[PDB]
Amino acid sequence: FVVKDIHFEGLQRVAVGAALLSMPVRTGDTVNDEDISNTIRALFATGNFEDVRVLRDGDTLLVQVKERPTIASITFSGNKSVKDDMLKQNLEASGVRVGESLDRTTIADIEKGLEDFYYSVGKYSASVKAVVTPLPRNRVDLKLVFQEGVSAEIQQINIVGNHAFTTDELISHFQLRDEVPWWNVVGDRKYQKQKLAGDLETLRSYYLDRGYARFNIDSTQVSLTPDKKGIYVTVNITEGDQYKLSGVEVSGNLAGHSAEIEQLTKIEPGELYNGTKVTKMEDDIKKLLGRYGYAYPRVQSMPEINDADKTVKLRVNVDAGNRFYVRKIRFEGNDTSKDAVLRREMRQMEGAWLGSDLVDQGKERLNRLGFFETVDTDTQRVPGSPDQVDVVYKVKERNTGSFNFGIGYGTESGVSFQAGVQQDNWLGTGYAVGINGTKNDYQTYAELSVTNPYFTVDGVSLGGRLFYNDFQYTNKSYGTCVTLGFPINEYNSLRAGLGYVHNSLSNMQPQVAMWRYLYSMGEHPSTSDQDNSFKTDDFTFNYGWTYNKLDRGYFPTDGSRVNLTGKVTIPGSDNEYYKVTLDTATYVPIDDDHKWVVLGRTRWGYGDGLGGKEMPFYENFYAGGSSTVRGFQSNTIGPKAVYFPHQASNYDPDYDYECATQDGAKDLCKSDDAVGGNAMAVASLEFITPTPFISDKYANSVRTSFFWDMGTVWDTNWDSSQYSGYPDYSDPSNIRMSAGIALQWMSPLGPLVFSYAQPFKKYDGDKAEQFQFNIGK
């Protein structure tokens, strides 16, 4: 039989031509019932529907397929542990495409697939139910709902066959927890399929680090209680035996670096075996060859085990391969940042041999720049060349710019304003700008900051700033500065910068600690009154130096830090002075495990007049508080205010202008209120030693110490001849000091500190504060 034409109806999903070309037998072909069934199989393949009827009443064939709504939209019920994106991506991967054919069989299948997904993510006992509803013109909407009980809780981890080590210690090293203490209820108990593998590798690492080179996990398995809350994990072990490490030997195609490899691969004979130090040895080998331009060396340790001698001979096989050269560096996703803003940061040159650590520390420098959410390198051999590669950096540019604006309005006070525009990475060129303002009702504050981090490509930054403040003692100041700051080693950094500062001082209380300063200026305000007003204009040469060698994160173990800053007034300033400062820190470990540490600290400072003028009192030094010496209120340690009797105090007595008031005493107040000194000395000896309230798994997370803090602040040119009846603040020997304890903790975003100290030596009016707390330092 031969068919001359084919008839269809509906053709909702597919046109006549597409259907005809899809089927195996087409118009004009010799066909029979079997070929018609094959066309029905093609109709199955397109996956619309299956029920069909056929008729052969002449030279043409009539075929039709029953039409029902199949094209499905998807909507979900309340999913709690598995998020929407996870759910929908899993659904799509399963095969239920949005706006695509669907069927009861498909619904059942996707039900079981979703169940398999839930149980895979460990939501055992879950149930999946899916339903559909009709829509006009062959469409439907898929509604599927889930019920899911308590997540599976690992009842125990039961290591078996371990010896010389207890189960609780090994499971202490697991990230899984069979119990969470009521001290740490924020902990976790949820089972995870892949985390178990990570913990089994942690157990293997532990035994290999203790030296059991024959260690094998000869079976590991999981079981599940009939009520499916409880999961049981059990793990068989055999260690075999403990082994010593014999002399390493290096073989293979060494590129003449044999001396620098042998001296690296030394070990003392009879050393106890350890897996991490072997891995570190192999990594240092391939790092060493990497530094000299072999981007892709092969290294493989292949230990030989003497079960009789209890010794392992660690063979290391090395071949350097061939040198690699970077012909191109590329950046991608850099839609905004000027390309030089990326290239300037990185250390790998183009047209040079590939240092595999230089590319990675380039990526680190790009992260530490901060403009990018993510950075990831790739490296691809160019076609037709054995020796040279492109390196390409993908990035996501973070949105760095910020803008905040605020208005306030009130009763008993007027309008208030704030504004704050800032953007590091300015117009992509890598400048940082900021402009900030605050018109209060009784204050005005504004400042402008711009900093070019590469004024020259070597990394000399040039900063500038402008500021203005005024208040309604009454104070107004405004000024500018520019600073050049440029590293001199990885550790050691230097910076310098001119500055200018106007300030106007008015309506201040008359007191000995500043009236002599005004006298040195030739400003002679009456001590009976508060009409005083003084104006001046500093021109300044600032400088500073810095040193960091701490080689640690949150808690330093060893090394030192120093910071130095100073000022000199440039000639032609309306006042003239200098000051200097040091901060230092010095950590000395008293055991070579760095578990006991002696920490010294100091601060220093001095400042004085030039040309017979005197240093402005607002530049004075203050000491006390956790930043300086613990157990004292902040700034309390200096010499105290000695006020003159003054009428018209604060424009009206108001009954609270204590001491020397309009209705106050005839004589000088000698307050408890501390002015600063013009000179300072501070020291600490701090001893850092953990105590049995610890676990080794958090003994790095908490640090405890006790210390002896010493401090003194004095007023080097206090005239003891006129005020001989009052304590001589010219004398440095009034050293005051405390001792105490401190506790420090390091949650991921910042250190946190507690301290207790007794100011066991102190003098009149020093405000003690036994208990002190601060973040970050």
Partner: protein, 364 residues
């Protein structure tokens, strides 16, 4: 927590009846702490009116079956033992397993350790004793037969293990010198006890309905042999009856799948995935009566006693069910934190251990 501890099992409200049988505690004693939250097979045992009982901490105690007073106590632990597997008795020896792969044999007279050996991994199964062998099933699917006088292994057989087990309790049984045993792979097997030769084995469940849950198929029930027919029952699989020698399936039932079936009067009594009690005939499993009223009030192994089926639930009630129609007969007092382990089919006595370790003697 954010998870709100939501409830999805919706356990059936408590069915209740007048206490016709007026169950009462003959005596009650504490044998230590309980098994508590750890699912495990510890249950009491009896010989010649001396009871023996055990604690997951390690404590083993012997009690008089009528007085409930201690005869002896041993701590059986280092200066916990994670004691498990559950007590068995033959002659003068008390055999006990551990989740740390030890097996202990204690003297009935005083409890002194007569021998102790290590088996391959945790011995979650109850030791099964026969004609000079102590046969123990481990969590590694190993069957190890220990010399009754000596504790040394005579032979071992390996049974395959799924990537995730349910529970390798799967205690064996002995018949005509062959041991018949379950296994986490869902195949009942038989081995020749003098020497461990494989005789036959048979798969009794479907697979591939899921990557995991629907192919959880553990035969953790004890099989039972009567008149030469083996009965076996598998978590998602069928109840099946088999010949002791052919290993052919006579018939299959889906009617129930999971737990601790028993047989008497040619009727099989069973507990399902969801805790419905039912009775079945040997002559092809069909429902004689069913008691689908207890679903998810996690039941225990049913014990036939005084013409009733006794079963304890997750919260402390001994449900008594009539042996010949599916109707409740009594409901004992709420006992200490519920039950999670078998009652023992002692003669005249009954004992059950609550999850807190209290043993209870139940009488009418």
């Amino acid at each position: 927590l954010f998870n709100s501890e939501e409830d999805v099992v919706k356990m059936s409200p408590l069915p209740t009846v007048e206490n016709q049988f007026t169950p009462t505690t003959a005596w009650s004693t504490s044998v230590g702490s309980g098994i508590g939250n750890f699912y495990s097979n510890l249950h009491p045992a009896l010989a010649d009116n001396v009871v023996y009982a055990a604690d997951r901490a390690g404590l083993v105690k012997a009690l008089n079956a009528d007085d409930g007073k201690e005869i002896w106590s041993v701590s059986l632990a280092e200066k916990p033992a994670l004691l498990s597997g559950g007590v068995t008795v033959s002659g003068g020896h008390v055999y006990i397993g551990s989740e740390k792969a030890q097996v202990y044999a204690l003297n009935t007279s005083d409890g002194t350790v007569a021998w102790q050996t290590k088996v391959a991994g945790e011995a979650l199964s109850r030791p099964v004793v026969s004609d000079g062998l102590v046969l123990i099933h481990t969590s590694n699917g190993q069957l190890q037969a220990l010399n009754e006088a000596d504790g040394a292994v005579k032979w071992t057989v390996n049974l395959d293990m799924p990537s995730l087990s349910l529970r390798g309790e799967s205690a064996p049984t002995t018949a005509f010198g062959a041991a018949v045993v379950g296994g986490d792979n869902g195949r009942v097997s038989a081995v020749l006890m003098e020497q461990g030769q494989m005789i036959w084995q048979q798969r009794i469940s479907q697979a591939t309905g899921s990557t995991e849950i629907d192919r959880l198929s553990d035969v953790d029930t004890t099989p039972v042999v009567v008149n030469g027919v083996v009965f076996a029952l598998a978590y998602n699989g069928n109840l099946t009856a088999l010949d002791l020698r052919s290993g052919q399936i006579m018939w299959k039932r889906e009617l129930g799948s999971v737990n601790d079936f028993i047989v008497d009067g040619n009727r099989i009594y069973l507990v399902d995935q969801n805790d419905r009690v039912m009775a079945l005939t040997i002559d092809g499993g069909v429902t004689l009566w069913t008691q689908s009223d207890l679903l998810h009030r996690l039941l225990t192994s049913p014990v036939l006693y005084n013409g009733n089926l006794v079963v304890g639930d997750s919260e402390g009630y001994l449900h008594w069910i009539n042996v010949e129609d599916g109707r409740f007969v009594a409901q004992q007092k709420v006992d200490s934190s519920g039950f999670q382990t078998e009652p023992v089919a002692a003669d005249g006595k009954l004992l059950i251990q609550a999850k807190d370790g209290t043993v209870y003697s139940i009488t009418r």
